[PDB]
Design an enzyme around this catalytic site. Structure first.
Site, PDB file in Angstrom:
ATOM      1  CB  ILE A 121      -0.981  -0.062   1.078  1.00 15.02           C
ATOM      2  CG1 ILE A 121      -1.949  -1.177   1.005  1.00 15.02           C
ATOM      3  CG2 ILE A 121      -1.444   1.433   1.493  1.00 15.02           C
ATOM      4  CD1 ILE A 121      -2.922  -1.262   2.435  1.00 15.02           C
ATOM      5  N   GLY A 122       0.528   2.329  -0.793  1.00 14.92           N
ATOM      6  CA  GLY A 122       1.303   3.651  -0.893  1.00 14.92           C
ATOM      7  C   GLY A 122       2.754   3.532  -1.543  1.00 14.92           C
ATOM      8  CG  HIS A 134       5.757   7.007  -0.607  1.00 13.23           C
ATOM      9  ND1 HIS A 134       4.872   7.597  -1.587  1.00 13.23           N
ATOM     10  CD2 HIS A 134       7.078   7.112  -1.239  1.00 13.23           C
ATOM     11  CE1 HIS A 134       5.858   8.001  -2.799  1.00 13.23           C
ATOM     12  NE2 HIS A 134       7.020   7.601  -2.687  1.00 13.23           N
ATOM     13  CG  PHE A 135       2.096   5.183   4.037  1.00 13.29           C
ATOM     14  CD1 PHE A 135       1.726   5.745   5.054  1.00 13.29           C
ATOM     15  CD2 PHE A 135       1.904   5.804   2.731  1.00 13.29           C
ATOM     16  CE1 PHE A 135       0.880   7.048   4.827  1.00 13.29           C
ATOM     17  CE2 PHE A 135       1.444   6.785   2.403  1.00 13.29           C
ATOM     18  CZ  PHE A 135       0.987   7.543   3.631  1.00 13.29           C
ATOM     19  N   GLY A 136       6.081   2.117   4.263  1.00 13.33           N
ATOM     20  CA  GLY A 136       6.841   0.962   4.699  1.00 13.33           C
ATOM     21  C   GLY A 136       6.393  -0.321   4.365  1.00 13.33           C
ATOM     22  CB  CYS A 137       7.081  -3.841   5.385  1.00  9.15           C
ATOM     23  SG  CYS A 137       8.834  -3.553   4.661  1.00  9.15           S
ATOM     24  CB  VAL A 138       1.767  -1.044   5.165  1.00 10.76           C
ATOM     25  CG1 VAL A 138       1.910   0.402   4.313  1.00 10.76           C
ATOM     26  CG2 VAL A 138       0.480  -1.146   5.506  1.00 10.76           C
ATOM     27  CE  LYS A 161       4.700  -0.144  10.762  1.00 10.69           C
ATOM     28  NZ  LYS A 161       4.778   0.946  11.639  1.00 10.69           N
ATOM     29  CG  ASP A 180       4.977  13.572  14.376  1.00 12.39           C
ATOM     30  OD1 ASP A 180       4.807  14.623  14.032  1.00 12.39           O
ATOM     31  OD2 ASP A 180       5.580  12.688  13.919  1.00 12.39           O
ATOM     32  NE  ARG A 211       4.651  14.903   9.642  1.00 12.33           N
ATOM     33  CZ  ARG A 211       4.717  16.145   9.941  1.00 12.33           C
ATOM     34  NH1 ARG A 211       4.553  17.170   9.161  1.00 12.33           N
ATOM     35  NH2 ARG A 211       5.174  16.520  11.274  1.00 12.33           N
ATOM     36  CG  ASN A 212       1.702  11.935  11.231  1.00  7.79           C
ATOM     37  OD1 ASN A 212       2.298  11.386  10.352  1.00  7.79           O
ATOM     38  ND2 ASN A 212       2.625  12.739  12.207  1.00  7.79           N
ATOM     39  CG  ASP A 219       2.688   8.908  13.234  1.00  5.42           C
ATOM     40  OD1 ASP A 219       3.557   7.977  13.169  1.00  5.42           O
ATOM     41  OD2 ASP A 219       3.164   9.963  13.888  1.00  5.42           O
TER      42      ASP A 219
HETATM   43  O1  LIG Z   1      -2.410   6.197  -2.133  1.00  8.61           O
HETATM   44  C1  LIG Z   1      -3.017   5.481  -1.063  1.00  8.61           C
HETATM   45  N1  LIG Z   1      -4.191   4.666  -1.034  1.00  8.61           N
HETATM   46  C2  LIG Z   1      -4.603   4.044   0.195  1.00  8.61           C
HETATM   47  C3  LIG Z   1      -3.149   4.411   0.887  1.00  8.61           C
HETATM   48  C4  LIG Z   1      -2.652   4.616   2.466  1.00  8.61           C
HETATM   49  C5  LIG Z   1      -3.132   3.754   3.516  1.00  8.61           C
HETATM   50  C6  LIG Z   1      -4.331   2.844   3.387  1.00  8.61           C
HETATM   51  N2  LIG Z   1      -4.776   2.176   4.316  1.00  8.61           N
HETATM   52  C7  LIG Z   1      -4.188   2.597   5.541  1.00  8.61           C
HETATM   53  N3  LIG Z   1      -4.558   1.996   6.641  1.00  8.61           N
HETATM   54  C8  LIG Z   1      -3.745   2.450   7.697  1.00  8.61           C
HETATM   55  C9  LIG Z   1      -2.883   3.181   7.344  1.00  8.61           C
HETATM   56  C10 LIG Z   1      -1.740   4.098   8.038  1.00  8.61           C
HETATM   57  C11 LIG Z   1      -0.509   3.503   8.341  1.00  8.61           C
HETATM   58  C12 LIG Z   1       0.229   2.785   7.221  1.00  8.61           C
HETATM   59  C13 LIG Z   1       1.431   2.189   7.608  1.00  8.61           C
HETATM   60  C14 LIG Z   1       1.853   1.926   9.007  1.00  8.61           C
HETATM   61  C15 LIG Z   1       0.932   2.212   9.738  1.00  8.61           C
HETATM   62  C16 LIG Z   1      -0.251   2.683   9.632  1.00  8.61           C
HETATM   63  C17 LIG Z   1      -3.162   3.351   5.992  1.00  8.61           C
HETATM   64  C18 LIG Z   1      -2.696   4.009   4.667  1.00  8.61           C
HETATM   65  C19 LIG Z   1      -1.631   5.377   2.369  1.00  8.61           C
HETATM   66  N4  LIG Z   1      -1.552   5.754   1.196  1.00  8.61           N
HETATM   67  C20 LIG Z   1      -2.514   5.327   0.180  1.00  8.61           C
END
Ligand SMILES: O=C1NCc2c(-c3cnc4[nH]cc(Cc5ccccc5)c4c3)c[nH]c21
Length: 277
Positions: free
Chosen positions: A30-31, A34-38, A56, A147, A151-152, A165
Site C-alpha cells: 500500500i502507498g 512511502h508507508f513502509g512494509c504495509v 504492517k 506528532d 500527514r499523520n 501515527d
Molecule cells: O494512495 C494510497 N491509497 C491508500 C493509502 C494509504 C493507507 C491505506 N490504508 C491504511 N490503513 C492504515 C494506514 C496508516 C498506516 C500505514 C502504515 C503503517 C501504519 C499505519 C493506511 C494508509 C496510504 N497511502 C495510500
C-alpha cells in the site's frame, strides 16, 4: 511462541487475529513503499464478512522481550476506538503483523494537495472538526500524540478522517534504504509534550487544511523556528479562511500553554463555524 508468559498470552487473546482469519497479499504494497512494509489484506470477522485491511509487518521485532512489549501495545491500543481515530483491528503472531482498517484516500495532506480532488472551504473545515473530535477523544484518555500534522491523519472511503501515527500505527513513514514546525514553543525549548502542546500542533494542522497543504514557514530554517516564534511571529491567515476560524488557530499558538483552548473548546467553536456552511 511457546516461550511467552501464559498470563500475558491470555491477556492478549481479545486482540489476536488467528492465522486462518487473515489473508495477507505480501505481493501488493500500500502507498508505493512511502508507508513502509504495509500490504493489502483481507480480515474475516466472526460472521465471515470480508474486511479490507492494511497489514504492517514488524521486522524490528526479533526477541521474546520485544514480542511481549508488542503484545502489550496491542492490548492498550485495542481500548482506543472512536470514529475519528485509526482503530486497531488486531495483531497476528514470520515477524508480528499489525492489522489496521484500509484508508481508501490515504493521508489527509496528500488528499488536500491533490489537484484532482477539489475539497470546498466547508469540506476542509469539516476535516478539521473531525480531527478536533478525534483529539478530544485522545485527550480525554490522557493520551498525548506528540506528532499531530495533516500527514499523520488518514482518510477513508466515506471521507472520515482518522487521527493516526500513534500506538502500533507509529513510524508510518519509515522507508528502507539500499516535526519542529508543528511543535509548541515550550516543547521546542524543554522537549516535554502535553495535551496543550498537541493543541498547538492542531492549530498548525488547521492552517495546513485551510491552505490546501501548503508547507508551514517555508522561508524559516527548523533551527530558527524557536526565535521566530519568540519574536511573536505566527503563520498568517490563509486566503479563504473565515476570521473566527483563524482566531481559533491563533489561540492555539499562545506562548502560555494554559491560555490555549482545550480540544473540547476546539470541537465546540469549530462545530459552530462549520454549521454556518
Ligand atoms: O494512495 C494510497 N491509497 C491508500 C493509502 C494509504 C493507507 C491505506 N490504508 C491504511 N490503513 C492504515 C494506514 C496508516 C498506516 C500505514 C502504515 C503503517 C501504519 C499505519 C493506511 C494508509 C496510504 N497511502 C495510500
Amino acid at each position: 511462541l511457546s516461550a511467552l508468559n501464559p498470563e500475558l498470552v491470555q491477556a492478549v487473546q481479545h486482540v489476536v487475529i488467528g492465522p486462518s482469519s487473515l489473508i495477507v497479499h505480501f505481493n501488493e504494497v500500500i502507498g508505493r513503499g512511502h508507508f513502509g512494509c504495509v500490504y493489502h489484506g483481507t480480515l474475516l470477522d466472526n460472521d465471515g464478512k470480508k474486511i479490507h485491511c492494511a497489514v504492517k509487518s514488524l521486522n524490528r521485532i526479533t526477541d521474546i522481550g520485544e514480542v511481549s512489549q508488542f503484545l502489550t501495545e496491542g492490548i492498550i491500543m485495542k481500548d482506543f476506538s472512536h470514529p475519528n481515530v485509526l482503530s486497531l483491528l488486531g495483531i497476528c503472531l514470520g515477524s508480528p503483523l499489525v492489522v489496521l482498517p484500509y484508508m481508501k484516500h490515504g493521508d489527509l495532506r496528500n488528499f488536500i494537495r491533490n489537484e484532482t480532488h477539489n475539497p470546498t472551504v466547508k469540506d476542509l473545515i469539516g476535516f478539521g472538526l473531525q480531527v478536533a473530535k478525534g483529539m478530544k477523544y485522545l485527550a480525554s484518555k490522557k493520551f498525548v500524540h506528540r506528532d499531530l500534522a495533516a500527514r499523520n491523519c488518514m482518510l477513508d472511503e466515506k471521507f472520515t478522517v482518522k487521527v493516526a501515527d500513534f500506538g502500533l500505527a507509529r513510524d508510518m513513514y519509515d522507508k528502507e534504504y539500499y516535526p519542529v514546525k508543528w511543535m509548541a514553543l515550550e516543547s521546542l525549548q524543554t522537549q516535554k509534550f502535553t495535551t496543550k502542546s498537541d493543541v498547538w500542533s492542531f492549530g498548525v494542522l488547521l492552517w495546513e487544511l485551510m491552505t490546501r497543504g501548503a508547507p508551514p514557514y517555508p522561508d524559516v530554517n527548523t533551527f530558527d523556528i524557536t526565535v521566530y516564534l519568540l519574536q511573536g511571529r505566527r503563520l498568517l491567515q490563509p486566503e479563504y479562511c473565515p476570521d473566527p476560524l483563524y482566531e481559533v488557530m491563533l489561540k492555539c499558538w499562545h506562548p502560555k500553554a494554559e491560555m490555549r483552548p482545550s480540544f473540547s473548546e476546539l470541537v465546540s467553536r469549530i462545530s459552530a463555524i462549520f454549521s454556518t456552511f
